[PDB]
Design an enzyme around this catalytic site. Structure first.
Site, PDB file in Angstrom:
ATOM      1  N   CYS A 164      45.632 -10.030  55.727  1.00  0.00           N
ATOM      2  CA  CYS A 164      45.058  -8.980  56.439  1.00  0.00           C
ATOM      3  C   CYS A 164      46.133  -8.337  57.262  1.00  0.00           C
ATOM      4  O   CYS A 164      45.968  -6.965  57.683  1.00  0.00           O
ATOM      5  CB  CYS A 164      43.790  -9.324  57.077  1.00  0.00           C
ATOM      6  SG  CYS A 164      42.662 -10.131  55.974  1.00  0.00           S
ATOM      7  N   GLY A 171      43.707 -14.358  56.238  1.00  0.00           N
ATOM      8  CA  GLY A 171      43.446 -15.335  55.342  1.00  0.00           C
ATOM      9  C   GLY A 171      44.465 -16.387  55.483  1.00  0.00           C
ATOM     10  O   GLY A 171      45.770 -16.147  55.973  1.00  0.00           O
TER      11      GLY A 171
END
Ligand SMILES: O=C(O)c1cnn(Cc2ccccc2)c1
Ligand SMILES: O=C(O)c1cnn(Cc2ccccc2)c1
Ligand SMILES: O=C(O)c1cnn(Cc2ccccc2)c1
Ligand SMILES: O=C(O)c1cnn(Cc2ccccc2)c1
Ligand SMILES: O=C(O)c1cnn(Cc2ccccc2)c1
Ligand SMILES: O=C(O)c1cnn(Cc2ccccc2)c1
Ligand SMILES: O=C(O)c1cnn(Cc2ccccc2)c1
Lengths: 728, 402, 402
Positions: B91, B390
């Site tokens: 991300c 993540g």
């Protein structure tokens, strides 16, 4: 490695026969046993046969693989695999690579190979059949096919993983065949594609095999002897890992596996899933070699040795009468009389009936003894609808049981098993009115879980024939019988109960009279450690997680609700009085305070309707929210591995005490008794095997166990101090 | 030594996943459009001074494969010496691209660098690239992989965030995004997407629902799309977080980030590079930091990364005027605000990904450019930008208005 | 500002494409094996001081998707604060990762970084990630895309390199790689790959053909497998290079780099990071540079990139003791040597990718670690490392022995 041989060589196992059509029949017939087994003799024998198949390739048209035993082929050499050390990883790897080179050469010979499966084909036996191009099985009774390597902590390392994945795809092969070692009857094996066709008798096998070879050569010349995954255009069922449909669900396969194992430390299912998916990403030969490396890591690991020690060596020392008195003949059992209707007394009557014994069910009244026979009745009311009706045999089983309400019907009984309320005065009575009406040689057996057998014996005149016979509910499913010797119990009485236990198809352990016997005493330390942690302020959710991740079938607080906490209070009071009577003093376990706090709150278990969990409509529905305020949950936060080890080590140390005190006389009884009796995690191999097989930060072995136990003793208490017998 | 300055920060509007306006647009075209916008704003800039183009991209496959940054250099007609590198840090890829650009400038070996990200989630869905952490069973089993949405539900369960708490933040995000759009806060930085003929394709953030109400958010059903609907992940999460008995599933499509397409571009350079090309600096990169936390809960990386970048800059929470944290899930923002005691009026003041969408590889560059504009609009001094990632990672950046 | 030092530099052996020993090894395991080897050499190093892991990977797909650098951090049991980012700049990805690591250290915002690359070409072949330049016919048509091999043949045509010229270099590379292996030059930097049981899988570069002859190289056929075998690419190249009438196809499998699997790791940190951990610096990273050239010829990027890094470091060709250029194609090295007048005794002195293979994302870090060892073995001072890149890019790095 590039040979069909691995290393007075062993004796030959395979007979060679080439008929006039060029079809070679390989009959497997190990002269050193009743079963063909993947031992050194087979490997050298198949190596010679495969060498010959290649050397004589120009005169051979087909191959049939058969067996001369009652079975086809079953099992590996456990005597050898249990000795494999981590330094032997290369030898283990070279062995399975040699086995699979033989099967691969057989599989790619350029001509059809048929497996004639006459009986059981299990483990390496089915792996041999999977390397053939066509499988014919005889639909005879008792025949099984499967890959049960996982049940010993191993995996199908002779190609079973690679071939079933190629045949069925990753999901179907893992779920239905590999992960649980499921055994299939020949009919079900044909339905799922494990077998191709069936014949009625074993005599039709080899003729049907040679006929199929003849037709395959005529109708499919180009494809004869070519497995589906060796053809151009092979598509794996369910797709490959790089297929978008399978890639969407693949990340959930390990998490669902963790969900089923509840986080327990069994390495074999993880290795099977890894080998299956990794193997599906590459060519067959590369996939096969990956399978070998995961096989070697399991064999040289400790868990596989634990499970091989328990479920192979220990269970067969017991069934061979290791604890049975030596030099005592058998004695017939004509009539059996159970002294009690209830969950115990009824189940004992059914298991005795199915074994071929007539049973007389006595109670306080025949309208209550009818309810007892109603338990076996509902058990038959279930067995009938599941397509498992023995018909006249089932009716005869229920007819064998005969309720009564009077001692007069125990006339011909020579084997008594009482199952009445735990009260000496009651037990002393219910044996008095029955002692003289039974046979002169009758055995007087008591199914008590608390009262001393020596004390109950004084209530009868023939104390040499009074013995403890402890069953576990449900009796029809629980496979352990705990036999308890009184001080005056004779060896003849012990031998006859031993034979009765084997006759009803259960497993006996022999325990000397002692408070708690073996199973109830050891499982008490498991429950009491959990209750201690709750009283110490550990989160209830962490305690249940530690129980499941340790490998227990039920977490300990859930088990306490089903053992009933009031019954736990009674065992505490009785243990007090007895200790005090003999002059001693009783150091109360911290769990008793937790038990008392729950009872005064009206939360005493599942039957009460409220315990550590909440109950609605009978089913369990979450922990009781008031639990955290009652015990200040969260005030203590030890590491999860400490909670896990506290429960396993408490049971392992109590087991070592029983062996030192002579309560048990063999570690085989300790291991099997703990696994099958109270649910000690199978990956340990038993509460006694757990000591020699411990593995953690400290290392592996008995010394690592001693070190970890001392570490636990410093942090939590001296009940974890290892006994003198475990020290060098 | 050299200080890194932001000279431009632009982004496309974010197109929605289903029947979205950007579905017909190659992700390469989204980047080239922003390059053309930079040329329009500085038609005399010597592009030979640009030494690298760094684009974050989380699913670099298909339309987004083959180093799409180099493809943007060639397709836009930039000099062949302008480099081009794709990177993936889940991300935070967009902010990592900017931070890497800033660090190249600080090192003295680069002078002017383009940085940003691009993600066409409607054409290249999340997970199209595969990966080991999910698809390799041996390592998936060992690291106890759990989808993001379940970690976010776990955060809400542990911290005591109710379904109404996360829905209240989602409503607030929709309102502040609508107020920012209607107030013209985004007019200078959102570059409308146009086709090969000049026709308009999209000029606003399609994912927004400005008429969101608390009652509508309450009718939504908990998340059940994709991996989370598959079984076992709840049990895997609780095997590690063993003191939690049951996970409260509070997150829905209405309080989680939207799946959208978009791209962003940031021009970063030294002072001498800006003076040479007549560029006015808009902000200065004060400090950057990368850290992380537990990868099973997977969304708690922002807090250590934020402390680390504050410590490296010698600042405290009170020295920061604006906090911008990507709104992957409502509970992640509420946890972040609770841990650092962030005042409510300083956090995501122009709305976030819940209302406008989270185009994985581009989001970090988008919310950074958002803060450059809001600092200049408020005449405020400092902003801190951070994203959860993540695998339990975290990236944080502090910028100072110039 | 801060100086960046190389403390360790290791690599796996390179397994061949057809029936290679590494085909059964997940590329994630190749990286984890190198991380474990760093632990053996420094058992007391505090891994919490490692702030990032940067891996080059040209085909981040399948086994190599999902940010393999983060997968390596988690699978190896490194701290969750250690980050992990994947990047792609085609053939220079491994060197770009090292350079980005050094520039992160020089900016003062990172202290100790692992950098390198991984490529399992036998499991994830070239082009598996797709590409916005081969799947966008409009882009392909405009950038005049041409495979690297035609660009290398075109370099041979323009410069007058004959089939015997490029085959003579290929023979020289096989010889020097064989001498390096025989002399024990690689004994401490090549880390044998082993399975989960400690069993050996590979301990040598199995693509080498040490008994190559000039007559054997002459028998090979011009390269005609892959995209080049298809039609049109000669005509596209000559539409731009319109003064060339016909391309001389001189490159074969015997004078081009091999397709192999491999990984490499480099530990890079500041002087303070080394002192605090008891690490001995082996080389200093003096300067880096990123340039490029025409994308149709596609392989002349290393020439301006080398001039750029020399000008930046204030050095000339005379000051460099060892030159290391990736042997993607024989003619690429011969043009670099001719254009800069490089002495033969200084160029690729331990053999190159023609003999040992070119595992895309890892090659840049492999030949960097090769030069660190050879500078120490020779007691020389400066090495220059550069690689040609698809898309017409160029990357170069100067190191100095410490
Ligand atoms: O697949 C099976 O179940 C199996 C069992 N034994 N073997 C052969 C073997 C024996 C000794 C040591 C290594 C391998 C294969
Ligand atoms: O449990 C059952 O009865 C069953 C029947 N079919 N299947 C699917 C399956 C396909 C291929 C191999 C194994 C299983 C499961
Ligand atoms: O998520 C799914 O779609 C799914 C389908 N079947 N299963 C069960 C399963 C568990 C472990 C390994 C393989 C399969 C999960
Ligand atoms: O050892 C056990 O207790 C066990 C239970 N399930 N399995 C395999 C399995 C996994 C996922 C779904 C279906 C089956 C093994
Ligand atoms: O006996 C062995 O060889 C062994 C190896 N790992 N473990 C522990 C473990 C179990 C299940 C899953 C992960 C780890 C036991
Ligand atoms: O405190 C003890 O000593 C103790 C011993 N066993 N239990 C649990 C138990 C309950 C009911 C029947 C069998 C065992 C507790
Ligand atoms: O080289 C090949 O493999 C090839 C295949 N088709 N063609 C002709 C073609 C030209 C333009 C557009 C589509 C197809 C060339």
């Amino acid at each position: 490695g590039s040979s069909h041989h691995h290393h007075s060589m062993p004796d030959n196992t395979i007979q060679w026969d080439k008929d006039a059509d060029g079809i070679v029949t390989l009959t497997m017939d190990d002269p050193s046993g009743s079963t063909n087994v993947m031992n050194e003799a087979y490997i050298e024998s198949m190596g010679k046969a495969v060498d010959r198949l290649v050397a004589e390739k120009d005169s051979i048209t087909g191959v049939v693989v058969a067996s001369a035993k009652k079975t086809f082929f079953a099992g590996g050499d456990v005597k050898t695999m249990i000795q494999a050390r981590p330094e032997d990883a290369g030898d283990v790897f070279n062995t399975v690579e040699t086995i699979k080179r033989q099967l691969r050469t057989l599989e790619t010979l350029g001509k059809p190979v048929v497996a004639a499966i006459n009986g059981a084909a299990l483990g390496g036996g089915l792996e041999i059949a999977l390397a053939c191009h066509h499988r014919i099985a005889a639909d005879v009774k008792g025949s099984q096919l499967g890959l049960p390597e996982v049940t010993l902590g191993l995996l199908p390392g002779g190609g079973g993983v690679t071939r079933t994945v190629r045949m069925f795809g990753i999901q179907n092969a893992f779920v239905s065949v590999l992960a649980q070692g499921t055994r299939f009857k020949p009919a079900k094996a044909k339905e799922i594609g494990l077998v191709d066709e069936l014949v009625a008798t074993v005599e039709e096998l080899v003729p049907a095999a040679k006929a199929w070879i003849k037709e395959e050569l005529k109708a499919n010349p180009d494809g004869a002897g070519v497995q589906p995954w060796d053809k151009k255009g092979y598509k794996m069922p369910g797709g490959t890992p790089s297929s978008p449909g399978l890639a969407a669900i693949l990340p959930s396969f390990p998490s669902n596996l963790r969900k089923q194992l509840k986080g327990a430390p069994m390495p074999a299912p993880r290795a099977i899933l890894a080998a299956a998916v990794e193997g599906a990403q590459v060519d067959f030969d590369t996939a096969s070699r990956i399978e070998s490396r995961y096989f070697a890591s399991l064999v040289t690991g400790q868990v596989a040795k634990n499970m091989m020690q328990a479920f192979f060596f220990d269970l067969q020392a017991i069934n061979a009468g290791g604890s049975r008195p030596e030099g005592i003949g058998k004695t017939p059992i004509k009539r059996i009389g159970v002294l009690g209707a209830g969950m115990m007394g009824a189940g004992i009557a059914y298991v005795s009936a199915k074994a071929g014994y007539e049973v007389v069910l006595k109670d306080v009244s025949l309208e209550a003894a009818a309810k007892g026979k109603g338990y076996s009745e509902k058990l038959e009311a279930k067995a009938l609808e599941r397509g498992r009706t023995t018909q006249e045999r089932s009716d005869a089983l229920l007819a064998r049981i005969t309720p009564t309400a009077d001692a007069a019907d125990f006339k011909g009984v020579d084997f008594v098993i009482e199952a009445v309320f735990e009260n000496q005065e009651l037990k002393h009575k219910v044996f008095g009115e029955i002692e003289d009406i039974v046979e002169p040689n009758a055995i007087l057996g008591s199914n008590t879980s608390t009262l001393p057998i020596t004390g109950l014996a004084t209530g009868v005149k023939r104390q040499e024939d009074f013995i403890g016979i402890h069953f576990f509910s449900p009796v029809d499913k629980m496979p352990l019988v705990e036999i308890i010797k009184g001080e005056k119990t004779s060896d003849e009485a012990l031998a006859r109960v031993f034979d009765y236990t084997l006759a009803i198809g259960k497993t006996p352990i022999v325990v000397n009279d002692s408070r708690g016997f073996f199973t109830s005493r050891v499982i008490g330390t498991f429950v009491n450690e959990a209750l201690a942690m709750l009283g110490e302020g550990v989160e209830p959710a962490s305690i249940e997680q530690a129980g499941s991740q340790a490998g227990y079938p039920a977490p300990p607080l859930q088990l306490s609700d089903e053992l009933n906490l009031e019954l736990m209070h009674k065992i505490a009071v009785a243990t007090r009085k007895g200790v005090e009577d003999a002059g001693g003093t009783y150091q109360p376990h911290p769990a008793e305070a937790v038990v008392e706090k729950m009872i005064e709150l009206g939360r005493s278990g599942r039957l009460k309707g409220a315990g550590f969990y909440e109950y609605a409509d009978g089913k369990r529905s979450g922990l009781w929210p008031g639990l955290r305020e009652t015990f200040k949950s969260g005030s203590s936060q030890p590491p999860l591995q400490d909670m896990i080890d506290r429960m396993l080590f408490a049971e392992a140390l109590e087991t070592q005490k029983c062996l030192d005190e002579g309560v048990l006389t063999s570690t085989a009884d300790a291991n099997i008794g703990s696994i099958m009796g109270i649910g000690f995690p199978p990956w340990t191999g038993g509460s006694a095997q757990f000591i020699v097989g411990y593995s953690g930060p400290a290392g592996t072995g008995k010394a690592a166990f001693v070190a970890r136990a001392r570490e636990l003793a410093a942090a939590y208490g001296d009940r974890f101090l290892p006994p003198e017998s475990l020290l060098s | 030594s050299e200080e890194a300055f932001i000279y431009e920060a632009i982004r496309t509007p974010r197109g929605k996943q289903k029947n979205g306006s950007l579905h017909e647009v190659k992700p390469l075209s989204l980047v080239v459009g922003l390059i053309d916008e930079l040329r329009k704003r500085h038609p005399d800039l010597d592009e030979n001074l640009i030494s690298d183009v760094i684009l974050g991209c989380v699913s670099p496959v298909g339309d987004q494969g083959g180093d799409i940054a180099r493809a943007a250099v060639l397709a836009s007609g930039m000099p062949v010496t302008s480099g081009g590198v794709q990177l993936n840090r889940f991300c935070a890829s967009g902010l990592e691209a900017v931070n890497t650009a800033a660090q190249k400038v600080r090192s003295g070996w680069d002078d002017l660098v383009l940085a940003g990200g691009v993600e066409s989630m409607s054409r290249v869905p999340m997970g199209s690239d595969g990966g080991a952490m999910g698809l390799d069973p041996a390592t998936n089993y060992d690291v106890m992989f759990v989808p993001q949405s379940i970690g976010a539900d776990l955060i809400a369960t542990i911290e005591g965030f109710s379904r109404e708490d996360v829905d209240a933040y989602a409503l607030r995000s929709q309102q502040k995004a609508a107020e920012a759009w209607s107030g013209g806060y985004f007019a200078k930085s959102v570059v409308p997407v146009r086709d090969q003929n000049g026709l308009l394709i999209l000029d606003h953030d399609e994912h927004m629902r400005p008429d969101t109400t608390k009652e509508g958010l309450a009718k939504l059903k908990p998340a059940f799309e994709g991996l989370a609907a598959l079984g076992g992940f709840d049990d895997v999460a609780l095997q590690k977080y063993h003191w939690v008995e049951k996970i409260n599933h509070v997150h829905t499509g209405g309080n989680s980030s939207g799946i959208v397409d978009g791209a962003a571009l940031v021009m970063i350079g030294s002072a001498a590079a800006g003076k040479l090309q007549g560029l006015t600096p808009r902000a200065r990169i004060v400090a950057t930091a990368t850290s992380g936390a537990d990868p099973v809960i997977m969304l708690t990386g922002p807090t250590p990364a934020t402390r680390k970048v504050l410590d490296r800059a010698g600042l405290t929470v009170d020295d920061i005027d604006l906090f911008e944290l990507n709104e992957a899930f409502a509970s992640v923002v509420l946890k972040f605000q609770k841990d650092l005691n962030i005042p409510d009026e300083k956090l995501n003041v122009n709305g976030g990904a819940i209302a406008m969408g989270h185009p994985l590889g581009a989001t970090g560059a988008m919310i950074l450019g958002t803060m450059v504009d809001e600092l200049e609009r408020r005449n405020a001094r400092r902003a801190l930008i951070t994203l959860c990632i993540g695998g339990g990672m975290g990236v944080a950046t502090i910028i100072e208005r110039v």
